[PDB]
Design an enzyme around this catalytic site. Structure first.
Site, PDB file in Angstrom:
ATOM      1  N   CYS A  58       5.833 -11.827  -0.141  1.00  0.00           N
ATOM      2  CA  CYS A  58       5.530 -10.640  -0.777  1.00  0.00           C
ATOM      3  C   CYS A  58       5.561 -11.143  -2.231  1.00  0.00           C
ATOM      4  O   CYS A  58       6.371 -11.526  -2.741  1.00  0.00           O
ATOM      5  CB  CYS A  58       6.478  -9.467  -0.761  1.00  0.00           C
ATOM      6  SG  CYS A  58       5.870  -7.970  -1.817  1.00  0.00           S
ATOM      7  N   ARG A  77       7.110  -8.990  -5.825  1.00  0.00           N
ATOM      8  CA  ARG A  77       8.367  -8.536  -5.584  1.00  0.00           C
ATOM      9  C   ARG A  77       8.762  -8.156  -7.176  1.00  0.00           C
ATOM     10  O   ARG A  77       9.960  -7.882  -7.309  1.00  0.00           O
ATOM     11  CB  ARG A  77       9.234  -9.242  -5.072  1.00  0.00           C
ATOM     12  CG  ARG A  77       9.055  -9.118  -3.610  1.00  0.00           C
ATOM     13  CD  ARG A  77      10.096 -10.125  -2.940  1.00  0.00           C
ATOM     14  NE  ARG A  77       9.163 -11.471  -2.508  1.00  0.00           N
ATOM     15  CZ  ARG A  77       9.710 -12.582  -2.389  1.00  0.00           C
ATOM     16  NH1 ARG A  77      11.084 -12.867  -2.158  1.00  0.00           N
ATOM     17  NH2 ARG A  77       9.114 -13.818  -2.184  1.00  0.00           N
ATOM     18  N   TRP A  81       0.831  -1.084  -3.909  1.00  0.00           N
ATOM     19  CA  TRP A  81      -0.719  -1.280  -4.175  1.00  0.00           C
ATOM     20  C   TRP A  81      -1.328  -2.530  -3.871  1.00  0.00           C
ATOM     21  O   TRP A  81      -0.424  -3.505  -3.873  1.00  0.00           O
ATOM     22  CB  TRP A  81      -0.832  -0.842  -5.721  1.00  0.00           C
ATOM     23  CG  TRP A  81      -0.320  -1.626  -6.872  1.00  0.00           C
ATOM     24  CD1 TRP A  81      -0.342  -2.830  -7.026  1.00  0.00           C
ATOM     25  CD2 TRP A  81       0.819  -1.445  -7.652  1.00  0.00           C
ATOM     26  NE1 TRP A  81       0.324  -3.636  -8.041  1.00  0.00           N
ATOM     27  CE2 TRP A  81       1.224  -2.552  -8.293  1.00  0.00           C
ATOM     28  CE3 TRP A  81       1.925  -0.401  -7.477  1.00  0.00           C
ATOM     29  CZ2 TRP A  81       2.272  -2.559  -9.223  1.00  0.00           C
ATOM     30  CZ3 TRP A  81       3.013  -0.392  -8.407  1.00  0.00           C
ATOM     31  CH2 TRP A  81       3.125  -1.399  -9.073  1.00  0.00           C
ATOM     32  N   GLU A  88      -6.804  -9.207  -1.470  1.00  0.00           N
ATOM     33  CA  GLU A  88      -6.521  -8.573  -0.028  1.00  0.00           C
ATOM     34  C   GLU A  88      -7.734  -7.834   0.685  1.00  0.00           C
ATOM     35  O   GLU A  88      -7.899  -8.084   1.829  1.00  0.00           O
ATOM     36  CB  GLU A  88      -5.428  -7.543   0.020  1.00  0.00           C
ATOM     37  CG  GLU A  88      -4.186  -8.121  -0.594  1.00  0.00           C
ATOM     38  CD  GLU A  88      -3.148  -7.047  -0.727  1.00  0.00           C
ATOM     39  OE1 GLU A  88      -2.291  -6.827   0.268  1.00  0.00           O
ATOM     40  OE2 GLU A  88      -2.549  -6.442  -1.581  1.00  0.00           O
TER      41      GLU A  88
HETATM   42  C1  HEM Z   1       3.823  -2.871  -5.544  1.00  0.00           C
HETATM   43  C2  HEM Z   1       2.771  -3.656  -5.370  1.00  0.00           C
HETATM   44  C3  HEM Z   1       2.876  -4.661  -4.042  1.00  0.00           C
HETATM   45  C4  HEM Z   1       2.025  -5.784  -4.148  1.00  0.00           C
HETATM   46  C5  HEM Z   1       1.000  -5.931  -5.082  1.00  0.00           C
HETATM   47  C6  HEM Z   1       2.247  -6.661  -2.838  1.00  0.00           C
HETATM   48  C7  HEM Z   1       1.424  -7.584  -2.518  1.00  0.00           C
HETATM   49  C8  HEM Z   1       1.456  -8.202  -1.057  1.00  0.00           C
HETATM   50  C9  HEM Z   1       0.819  -9.197  -0.499  1.00  0.00           C
HETATM   51  C10 HEM Z   1      -0.527  -9.615  -1.161  1.00  0.00           C
HETATM   52  C11 HEM Z   1       1.407  -9.498   0.480  1.00  0.00           C
HETATM   53  C12 HEM Z   1       0.490 -10.245   1.634  1.00  0.00           C
HETATM   54  C13 HEM Z   1       0.200  -9.217   2.635  1.00  0.00           C
HETATM   55  C14 HEM Z   1      -1.147  -9.580   3.355  1.00  0.00           C
HETATM   56  O1  HEM Z   1      -1.733 -10.645   3.096  1.00  0.00           O
HETATM   57  O2  HEM Z   1      -1.321  -8.819   4.339  1.00  0.00           O
HETATM   58  C15 HEM Z   1       2.473  -8.817   0.775  1.00  0.00           C
HETATM   59  C16 HEM Z   1       3.194  -8.777   1.956  1.00  0.00           C
HETATM   60  C17 HEM Z   1       4.365  -7.994   2.301  1.00  0.00           C
HETATM   61  N1  HEM Z   1       5.154  -6.840   1.208  1.00  0.00           N
HETATM   62 FE1  HEM Z   1       4.375  -6.746  -0.952  1.00  0.00          FE
HETATM   63  N2  HEM Z   1       3.245  -5.793  -2.284  1.00  0.00           N
HETATM   64  C18 HEM Z   1       3.453  -4.718  -2.950  1.00  0.00           C
HETATM   65  C19 HEM Z   1       4.734  -3.751  -2.627  1.00  0.00           C
HETATM   66  C20 HEM Z   1       5.538  -4.027  -1.418  1.00  0.00           C
HETATM   67  C21 HEM Z   1       6.468  -3.135  -1.294  1.00  0.00           C
HETATM   68  C22 HEM Z   1       6.873  -1.764  -1.977  1.00  0.00           C
HETATM   69  C23 HEM Z   1       7.337  -3.400  -0.153  1.00  0.00           C
HETATM   70  C24 HEM Z   1       8.218  -2.947   0.712  1.00  0.00           C
HETATM   71  C25 HEM Z   1       8.967  -1.824   0.133  1.00  0.00           C
HETATM   72  C26 HEM Z   1       6.479  -4.628   0.090  1.00  0.00           C
HETATM   73  C27 HEM Z   1       6.986  -5.707   1.279  1.00  0.00           C
HETATM   74  C28 HEM Z   1       6.104  -6.615   1.908  1.00  0.00           C
HETATM   75  C29 HEM Z   1       6.410  -7.208   3.080  1.00  0.00           C
HETATM   76  C30 HEM Z   1       7.610  -6.967   4.013  1.00  0.00           C
HETATM   77  C31 HEM Z   1       5.030  -8.106   3.152  1.00  0.00           C
HETATM   78  C32 HEM Z   1       4.955  -9.172   4.353  1.00  0.00           C
HETATM   79  C33 HEM Z   1       4.182  -8.172   5.567  1.00  0.00           C
HETATM   80  C34 HEM Z   1       3.568  -8.798   6.662  1.00  0.00           C
HETATM   81  O3  HEM Z   1       4.529  -9.915   7.033  1.00  0.00           O
HETATM   82  O4  HEM Z   1       2.609  -8.768   6.907  1.00  0.00           O
HETATM   83  N3  HEM Z   1       5.534  -5.108  -0.736  1.00  0.00           N
HETATM   84  N4  HEM Z   1       2.717  -8.014  -0.357  1.00  0.00           N
HETATM   85  C1  LIG Z   2       2.472  -2.039   1.984  1.00  0.00           C
HETATM   86  S1  LIG Z   2       2.298  -3.736   2.057  1.00  0.00           S
HETATM   87  C2  LIG Z   2       2.753  -4.501   0.582  1.00  0.00           C
HETATM   88  C3  LIG Z   2       2.204  -3.126  -0.416  1.00  0.00           C
HETATM   89  C4  LIG Z   2       0.664  -3.223  -1.014  1.00  0.00           C
HETATM   90  C5  LIG Z   2       0.085  -4.442  -0.529  1.00  0.00           C
HETATM   91  N1  LIG Z   2      -0.949  -4.692  -1.229  1.00  0.00           N
HETATM   92  N2  LIG Z   2       0.479  -5.171   0.732  1.00  0.00           N
HETATM   93  C6  LIG Z   2      -0.030  -4.478   1.833  1.00  0.00           C
HETATM   94  C7  LIG Z   2      -0.737  -5.472   3.104  1.00  0.00           C
HETATM   95  C8  LIG Z   2      -2.060  -4.740   2.942  1.00  0.00           C
HETATM   96  C9  LIG Z   2      -3.366  -5.639   3.678  1.00  0.00           C
HETATM   97  N3  LIG Z   2      -3.266  -6.928   3.362  1.00  0.00           N
HETATM   98  C10 LIG Z   2      -4.612  -5.010   3.353  1.00  0.00           C
HETATM   99  O1  LIG Z   2      -5.449  -5.601   2.779  1.00  0.00           O
HETATM  100  O2  LIG Z   2      -5.090  -3.848   3.857  1.00  0.00           O
END
Ligand code: HEM
Ligand SMILES: CSCCCC(=N)NCCC[C@H](N)C(=O)O
Ligand code: HEM
Ligand SMILES: C[C@H](O)[C@H](O)[C@H]1CNc2nc(N)[nH]c(=O)c2N1
Ligand SMILES: C[C@H](O)[C@H](O)[C@H]1CNc2nc(N)[nH]c(=O)c2N1
Ligand SMILES: CSCCCC(=N)NCCC[C@H](N)C(=O)O
Ligand SMILES: [Zn+2]
Lengths: 407, 411
Positions: free
Chosen positions: A106, A109, A278, A283
């Site tokens: 992520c 973070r 968000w 993405e």
């Molecule tokens: C607040 C703004 C956030 C942004 C901008 C963000 C951004 C991202 C991005 C770009 C990825 C790669 C996901 C993909 O390519 O599908 C990711 C993965 C992930 N995020 Fe964040 N995220 C946010 C919030 C959160 C929150 C609130 C949580 C948990 C409470 C979280 C937990 C995770 C986890 C577990 C992954 C890996 C999920 C997977 O393996 O598909 N994220 N995030």
């Molecule tokens: C809830 S996950 C982290 C929170 C916000 C986020 N940006 N990541 C979500 C993965 C979404 C996926 N890559 C998509 O393009 O729909």
């Protein structure tokens, strides 16, 4: 055993000590790196409970205090007679914030400590689940000024009373296989979409049909529900210079809410725990729109830009990719729906790494996922060495429910 | 033990058995992945197994495993090791070795070409002047007036580690970097340190933005000596853009022949500390990294100023916009001048085919995803979506420290 990471653009060097508190296994060996693979009892529960409670009480600066020891005994007594135990609200919240803090994939973070946790452990039915979800969607959406949230359903017991959200995200578009051969809508959701039809969904059969929710309470068979549409904020996609962009008829949803993961805190397993943040613009604009196996719109867009598609070396795919991503960002901004571009989000993540190195002794991060899928080397994360390791509390992948659930 | 890798775009699953033949370590443990870390005198004792392994491999490739000729060559290497503490490779073995080091290079996207490599045996070389002459011939042969051909030149192997051949340059052709008193850099910031050494060894620096560096050559553990490559052998390409007539006025050029000279080639336990090799460029090496890294020529700002992008907010993607035009220019320029180059779409597609072939015929293709995926437009190339297994096979190309850090100066 103490490890250094170097930024090759700035020469900054950080020492990682946090990885020694690492627990779970990576998939890698000394003979073989698996860095690019997507997916590599009472006697067991107690160390896990202890390890977690130890870090909790250390974080509130109450390590080895009476209140610490007391809780440790209390949790042990509960395990011995009930075979499980219940988290205090404070521990629940700390656990969820930290699962996010530890998510090595992520980029977002820097935000980890501003997480709204909705405790749904009192939930008992699917209808209940649906009510909690709408309230999450509405709270998090916040008329466009998005706020991070997680909603936590009851924990696993015997694995036959599981709570699960069958959707991969709370909000996603449908996918239909067509007589012509091709796919209408989102090919990633084709199988999930079929299941909805099989369970009774009247599908509109369009390109952007918001899927229904498919909810499973207490290991019962799942039930369908339509999220109220006034709750599903969407953005029509236009371009700031190209007037013709609108006619491609693209829209996306504002709320990314991953719903298929398992949250493990102190050895306890929350199999239904949707969370949302968000979007970073790539993405949607790079992946969702341009993946060959997603909406795959590069061909159409490049056509409208009158680029030369005869040879790969005109970089026509690349030119179009840029404008598509300009248009996603512009649209979200113009409608005041929170979005972040990949430059700004990676810059924030570098600042976050530094902070974690300085205050925690390191930060696990998976370079393969952190580096955005366009313009990699012009974002600072490209030049940053990262150590990937597995800390608990955590979010984990889990098998899709249909491959496992018994009807 | 079989291992599976999936392409998430095509759902093609492959099966790796080759990783079983790996000896060298990754830097990763069951507890830590170091997959993104950039950089993670032998005994008679350790040398014969390494020889044996290699010769077992060599003889299998030629379908002569267990032959009298195979056994006799083992016994002969064995004897040579006890009597002299090292051994000499036959020509065929050296050629096979150099080709396999390339084939095994997990960070190289260009490996489909691995079997077409011209090997220049420079093991009879004794002096720096001798090295300069070999290097000149390599450069002229490889350049071939723009129709580039892969080659490697192999100087004598390490003996006691006190008599090494080294090429102090990191590539045969590269531009000087000059740190100015005001803290700016003129030319390529990546070569400032090597440039200073050159100056100190007596190079008269022209002090411009694209000065080809002189060769700094160490033979037989002696102090190194300076040589100007003849300019007529240095093919260069001025950079222009197909539609933007102002692009030329930036004054950019680049050299056509990329030739890495600082790596160490290991074959059958033997160490070749000077073994420059060259291929040809993928467009992004120059247009993304060499031009657009902040620690390199750093031209994004200047190009975006001339295109009149909105540079006030990063979310205009002004950087991404200029980045593509620069890369279009690089490719356009090379093609127009008939100098071999490959775009990152075509190079990655080729690699996927190579990799699949390698699984079918060899049981695997070790690959470093971090390096294989191009530094722009990652996910619109098929390698982004390809799972890879990284592991270390010999023969191989290794990193080695910079010689100015280890060299014992004679004066
Ligand atoms: C607040 C703004 C956030 C942004 C901008 C963000 C951004 C991202 C991005 C770009 C990825 C790669 C996901 C993909 O390519 O599908 C990711 C993965 C992930 N995020 Fe964040 N995220 C946010 C919030 C959160 C929150 C609130 C949580 C948990 C409470 C979280 C937990 C995770 C986890 C577990 C992954 C890996 C999920 C997977 O393996 O598909 N994220 N995030
Ligand atoms: C809830 S996950 C982290 C929170 C916000 C986020 N940006 N990541 C979500 C993965 C979404 C996926 N890559 C998509 O393009 O729909
Ligand atoms: C024929 C055309 C070739 C192409 C297009 C090509 C492409 C590339 C690219 C893009 C890289 C990463 C370079 C970087 O980012 O600095 C690379 C790395 C590498 N290549 Fe190839 N290559 C070619 C030929 C060769 C040859 C002939 C050899 C040796 C015989 C070779 C061996 C290697 C090695 C050892 C690396 C990793 C070097 C390092 O870690 O710095 N390549 N190649
Ligand atoms: C094979 C490879 O691991 C796979 O394509 C990964 C690469 N990096 C990724 N990075 C992000 N952020 N999201 C992804 O889905 C992927 N896919
Ligand atoms: C930290 C990181 O490993 C480093 O920036 C790597 C990433 N990928 C790369 N990939 C290539 N081809 N060349 C490079 O120099 C790098 N640098
Ligand atoms: C000789 S090594 C592989 C053969 C040719 C090549 N394409 N790669 C060389 C690395 C060049 C470096 N990226 C540069 O931008 O000069
Ligand atoms: Zn690894």
């Amino acid at each position: 055993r103490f490890l250094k990471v170097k930024n090759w653009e700035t020469d900054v060097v950080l020492t990682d000590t946090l990885h020694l508190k690492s627990t779970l296994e990576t998939g890698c060996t000394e003979h073989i790196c698996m860095g690019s693979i997507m997916l590599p009892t009472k006697d067991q529960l107690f160390p896990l409970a202890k390890e977690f409670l130890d870090q909790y009480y250390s974080s509130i600066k109450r390590f080895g205090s009476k209140a610490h020891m007391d809780r440790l005994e209390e949790v042990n007594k509960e395990i011995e007679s009930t075979s499980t135990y219940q988290l205090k609200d404070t521990e629940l919240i700390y656990g969820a914030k930290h699962a996010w803090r530890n998510a090595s994939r992520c980029v977002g973070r820097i935000q980890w400590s501003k997480l709204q946790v909705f405790d749904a452990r009192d939930c008992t039915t699917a209808h209940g689940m649906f009510n909690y979800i709408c309230n999450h969607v509405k709270y998090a959406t916040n008329k466009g000024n998005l706020r991070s949230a997680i909603t936590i359903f009851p924990q696993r017991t015997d694995g036959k009373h599981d709570f699960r959200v069958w959707n991969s995200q709370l909000i996603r578009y449908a996918g239909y296989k067509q007589p012509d051969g091709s796919t209408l809508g989102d090919p990633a959701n084709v199988q999930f979409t079929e299941i909805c039809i099989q369970q009774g969904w009247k599908a509109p059969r369009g390109r952007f049909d918001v899927l229904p929710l498919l909810l499973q309470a207490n290991g019962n068979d799942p039930e369908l529900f339509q999220i109220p549409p006034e709750l599903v904020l969407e953005v029509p996609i236009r371009h700031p210079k190209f007037d013709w962009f609108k006619d491609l008829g693209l829209k996306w949803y504002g709320l990314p809410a991953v719903s298929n993961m398992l949250l493990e805190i102190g050895g306890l397993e929350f199999s239904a725990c949707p969370f949302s943040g968000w979007y970073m613009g790539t993405e949607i604009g790079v992946r969702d729109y341009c993946d060959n196996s997603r909406y795959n719109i590069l061909e159409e867009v490049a056509k409208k830009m009158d680029l030369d598609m005869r040879k790969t070396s005109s970089l026509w795919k690349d030119q179009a990719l840029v404008e598509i991503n300009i248009a996603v960002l512009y649209s979200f901004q113009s409608d005041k729906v929170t979005i972040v571009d990949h430059h700004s989000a990676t810059e924030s993540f570098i600042k976050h790494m530094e902070n974690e190195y300085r205050c925690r002794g390191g930060c696990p991060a998976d370079w393969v996922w952190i580096v955005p899928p366009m313009s990699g080397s012009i974002t600072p994360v490209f030049h940053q060495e990262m150590l990937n390791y597995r800390l608990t509390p955590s979010f984990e992948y889990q098998p899709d429910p249909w491959n496992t659930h018994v009807w």
